[PDB]
Ligand binder design. Structure first.
Ligand SMILES: CCCCCCC[C@H](C)CCC[C@H](C)CCC[C@H](C)CCC[C@H](C)CCC[C@H](C)CCCOP(=O)(O)C(F)(F)[C@@H]1O[C@H](CO)[C@@H](O)[C@H](O)[C@@H]1O
Ligand SMILES: CCCCCCCCCCCCCCCC(=O)OC[C@@H](O)CO
Ligand SMILES: *[C@@H]1O[C@H](CO)[C@@H](O)[C@H](O)[C@H]1NC(C)=O
Ligand SMILES: CCCCCCCCCCCC
Lengths: 103, 281
């Protein structure tokens, strides 16, 4: 088939409240082939402890993954989702943003 | 119950003549219920009820069957693509399982893809090549139908007999653990600018099950034309997340709200009032 670059969507599970714990989600979908590097980031560094689903795939056969971890949002702290894949020349970073719908 | 499906997903990545990786999981509709330990070749039961009503004896036999199938698949494929076939690397996907339909017979299926393209599927007693994937699919199907003839009967019985019986047990075992209705939380935020003289409002609805949901922006009892539902995305443990946005021009008056209807709520809609500015940055 044709290689397909991943789509990346980032969102929190609960309303964001500075100093209150929450869950950060990153949904990576629509990609092919399956070799992928997804990391959740706190201030640019990979969070060592995350939860992730196994690989699944749609019926067009493209793959998707869900990542999530606990986190505490903050004025200073930047949280993000980083993805590398063969269709990408360098890692793509999608930041989490409250003042936007993380849209 | 209604239409409900159980799927075993497998992904085989062949990197060279000496290296391949297998990966696999089991899914009850959109909830992952099983994993596969690729290091020791064993089934991972992700929930307390993931064994359904099967005995340890039955599941031991199934685990052995899976090992035999996976080792034999790897061995055969690697044997047939030797040394310098420019196919490397390549990847094989397998989707196998069953569906229950209320009042009708179950369905079993076993579908294969090569490098993301339909390759072949199993049709009751025969491996049938996809009319789109040509010569390779025909050659694979020749081998499966003529050489490994004496395992067709296994695959059939696995997907059409064993799978429905297991799914029925799994559904029954989950009843002491899993929710058939989960209520969502909801909250308001702004979004990115849709354009000069305009702003965007976002209604977040998080953690609801099952999937059907209704969300609209409102001025009192009047539903707003600009309402737009985003894509529905997964959360942990088979629940769902949704964003409903509204584009607002400078001059819109205070008094907008978001209204959420869901079966888990049953007559008490969530209503959230926008208490921020309506002046676009
Ligand atoms: C990555 C793996 C998947 C991930 C797992 C995830 C966990 C999993 C979701 C847990 C859920 C379990 C539910 C209940 C599963 C419900 C049904 C499923 C839909 C079916 C999917 C079809 C499967 C995948 C393909 C195997 C068929 C193969 C072609 C047949 C093998 C033929 O081998 P065989 O020759 O017939 C022999 F039997 F082995 C012989 O037996 C002798 C023993 O005494 C031995 O000594 C002899 O030498 C000889 O080996
Ligand atoms: C203990 C079980 C033993 C085997 C397990 C069952 C797996 C059997 C699957 C065999 C697949 C072999 C693929 C062969 C691909 C091939 O032969 O390619 C043909 C080319 O010649 C195209 O022209
Ligand atoms: C095959 O690929 C694996 C994984 O990259 C590598 O470790 C191994 O050296 C390769 N084997 C050969 C013979 O090139
Ligand atoms: C050259 C590699 C061909 C890929 C073979 C895939 C066949 C999978 C069917 C296995 C069912 C038992």
């Amino acid at each position: 088939a044709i290689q397909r670059t991943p789509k990346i969507q980032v969102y929190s599970r609960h309303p964001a409240e500075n100093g209150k714990s929450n869950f950060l989600n990153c949904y990576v979908s629509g990609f092919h082939p399956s070799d992928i590097e997804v990391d959740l980031l706190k201030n640019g560094e990979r969070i060592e402890k995350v939860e992730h689903s196994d690989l699944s795939f749609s019926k067009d056969w493209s793959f998707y993954l869900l990542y999530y971890t606990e986190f505490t949002p903050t004025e200073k702290d930047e949280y993000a989702c980083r993805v590398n894949h063969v269709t990408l020349s360098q890692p793509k970073i999608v930041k989490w943003d409250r003042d936007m719908g993380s849209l | 119950s209604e239409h409900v499906s159980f799927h075993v997903i497998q992904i085989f990545s062949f990197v060279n003549q000496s290296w391949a990786r297998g990966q696999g999981s089991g899914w009850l509709d959109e909830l992952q219920t099983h994993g596969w330990d690729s290091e020791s070749g064993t089934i991972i039961f992700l929930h307390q009820w993931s064994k359904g009503q099967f005995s340890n004896e039955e599941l031991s036999d199934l685990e052995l069957l899976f090992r035999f199938y996976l080792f034999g698949l790897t061995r055969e494929i690697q044997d047939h693509a030797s040394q310098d076939y420019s196919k490397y690397p390549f990847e094989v996907q397998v989707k196998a399982g069953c569906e229950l339909h209320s009042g009708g017979s179950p369905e079993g299926f076993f579908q294969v893809a090569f490098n993301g393209l339909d390759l072949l599927s199993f049709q009751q007693t025969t491996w049938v090549p996809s009319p789109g994937c040509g010569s390779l699919a025909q050659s694979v199907c020749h081998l499966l139908n003529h050489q490994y003839e004496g395992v067709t009967e296994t695959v059939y019985n696995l997907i059409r007999s064993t799978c429905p019986r297991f799914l029925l047990g799994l559904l029954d075992a989950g009843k002491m653990y899993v929710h058939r209705q989960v209520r969502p939380e909801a909250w308001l935020s702004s979004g990115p600018s849709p354009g000069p003289g305009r702003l965007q409002l976002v209604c977040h609805v998080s953690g609801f099950y099952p999937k059907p949901v209704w969300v609209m922006w409102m001025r009192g009892e009047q539903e707003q034309q600009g309402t737009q539902l985003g894509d529905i995305l997964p959360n942990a443990n088979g629940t769902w997340y949704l964003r409903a946005t509204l584009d607002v021009a400078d001059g819109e008056a205070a008094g907008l709200s978001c209204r959420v209807k869901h079966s888990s709520l049953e007559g008490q809609d969530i209503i959230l009032y926008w208490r921020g500015s309506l002046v676009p940055r």
